[PDB]
Amino acid sequence: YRDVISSFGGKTSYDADNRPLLLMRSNFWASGYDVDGTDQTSLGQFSGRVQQTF
């Protein structure tokens, strides 16, 4: 309904269609580093861990 009103050039409050009010949105990407194996079997393979502050 709020899209139909917007096409005419009007607007509706969030109480008109009984919808929640958005306050803030945040978007980010998570990265990390790698850990190397050092024993006989795993010398040459790696394991990744993701740790990101926000």
Binding site: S31, Y33, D34
Partner: peptide, 26 residues
């Protein structure tokens, strides 16, 4: 250690809209 080729799947969008699903979708 790797920014451009690990973050995202394409380039920045500077052009016309591509997708129309009937409204906002997040």
């Amino acid at each position: 250690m790797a920014k451009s080729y690990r973050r995202g799947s394409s380039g920045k969008k500077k052009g016309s809209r591509l997708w129309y699903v009937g409204g906002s979708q997040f």
